[PDB]
């Protein structure tokens, strides 16, 4: 039989920014 | 039979920011 | 028979920023 | 003076599917 | 005067998916 | 001064797929 599919598309988006040990004096 | 499927698209989003110890003297 | 189906599209969203030890003096 | 800042992040998430017209018999 | 600064990281998504004009007989 | 930035990282996502016009008989 006839059959349309659309599996996944599944996006996935992340951000881990980092700012180092400030020792502002 | 016929069938129309769209599975998935989960998107999912995260963001993990991070500043280090700061010692601001 | 025929069918039309839409499943997942669960999008989630998640922030957990972070500010280090602030030793402002 | 000292300033730690962290302006944005603003994460904006959407999703608009569409099925045609489904002329189904 | 000392700065630490992280401005945007405005992360947006989008999803916009379309199936045409479904005529299943 | 000093001054530390971290100016950008906008992650914009999409996605806009498309099945065409389905004549399934």
Same mark, same amino acid.
């Given at each position: !039989? &006839?059959? #349309?599919? &659309? &599996? !996944?598309?599944?996006?996935? &988006?992340?951000?881990?920014? #980092?700012? !180092?040990?400030?020792?502002?004096?």
């Amino acid at each position: !039989g &006839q059959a #349309w599919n &659309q &599996q !996944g598309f599944n996006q996935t &988006q992340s951000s881990a920014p #980092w700012m !180092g040990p400030n020792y502002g004096v």
